[PDB]
Amino acid sequence: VEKFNAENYWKKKGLAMVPLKFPVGLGSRAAGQAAALVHIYLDGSVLVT
Amino acid sequence: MGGQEHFYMETQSMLVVPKGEDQEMDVYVSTQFPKYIQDIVASTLKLPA
């Protein structure tokens, strides 16, 4: 990229690296609660929600 | 001893509504046994319950 930029006046290249820390978590324990419902029918098949 | 007609004032009535996804049926029916309706319809369509 430095080679290109020294050789080219009206076009330039650039390069960057960036690190990531994305913390995950809500305000409280109640905000992160969750629920489901599961039925098994007599033919063995399952309905979930 | 003679028989007897039920003579429920509401005659046999149903509305059968396909969802249009994964062969889902919703069956609205005047019945005493929803689970049996589920089974016979599912069986007929060759679908899991």
Kindly state the tokens that stand for A4: 């290109």
Q: What was the elucidation method?
A: X-ray
Residue A47 with chain B: CB contacts under 8 Å: 49
CB contact burial A11-46 (16+ within 10 A = b; e otherwise): eeeeeeeeeeeeeeeeeeeeeeeeeeeeeeeeeeee
The answer, for B19 touching chain A at a CB cutoff of 8 Å, is no
For residue B26, which of B14, B12, B10, B44 has the smallest C-alpha distance? B14
CB contact under 8 A, B48 and A42: no
Distance CA A31, CA B39 (A): 39
Tell me the shortest Cα–Cα distance from B48 to chain A, in angstroms.
6
Tell me the shortest Cα–Cα distance from A36 to chain B, in angstroms.
19
The answer, for A41 touching chain B at a CB cutoff of 8 Å, is yes
Radius of gyration (Cα) for chain B, nearest Å? Answer: 14
Per DSSP bridges, beta strands B14-18 and B25-29 are antiparallel
